[PDB]
C-alpha cells in the first residue's frame, strides 16, 4: 500500500468473491513477524470462508 493509516485509524479492506493465495509471500520469509495465533499459517487457507 502506498499509504498506511495510523494504528488508531487502521485501514480496513474487505475481501470477497475471490481466491485467497498467499504462499508466494509466506515462503519468502520477507516479514519480520508472521504470528498466526491459534491457527496454522498455511492450512487456514484450505477452506471456503
Amino acid at each position, epitope marked *: 500500500a502506498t499509504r498506511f493509516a495510523s494504528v488508531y485509524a487502521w485501514n480496513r479492506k474487505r475481501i470477497s468473491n475471490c481466491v485467497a493465495d498467499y504462499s508466494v509471500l509466506y515462503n519468502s520469509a520477507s516479514f519480520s513477524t508472521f504470528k498466526c495465533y491459534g*491457527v496454522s499459517p498455511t*492450512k487456514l487457507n*484450505d*477452506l471456503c470462508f
Partner: nanobody
Amino acid sequence: HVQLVESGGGLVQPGGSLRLSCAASGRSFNSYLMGWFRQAPGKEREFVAWISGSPHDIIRYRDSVKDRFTISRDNAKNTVYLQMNSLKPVDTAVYYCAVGSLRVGSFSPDYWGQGTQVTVSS
C-alpha cells in the same frame, strides 16, 4: 427450520463427571460455532463454552468453568458435546445449547434449544 434438542441431563455429585449433548438439525453449521450456556436458577444465563466447526477449531470457556466443562462438537452429525468434569455444588444450573455465527470475533448465538437441568448437590 432449525431445531436444537438436548439430552443427558440429571444430577451429579460434587467431583463426579457428566456429559450433556445437544444435536442440531435442519441446516448445516460448519460456518457456525457450537456452544453451551448455563442458567443457575434465579440468575442470568451465563456462558459455558463454545467450539467452532473448522479445521482449526477455536474453543472458548466461561471463567467459573474454564478447563472443567470441556466442549467438543461434530460436523457430520451437527451436534455439540459438553463433558462436565469434577463438579461442585455451584455448578447447578439449566444448560442450554446455542448455535451461532462468529461476528466481530465474538460468538453470536442465533438458534437456541429448550435446555436441560444439570444439578450438583451434596
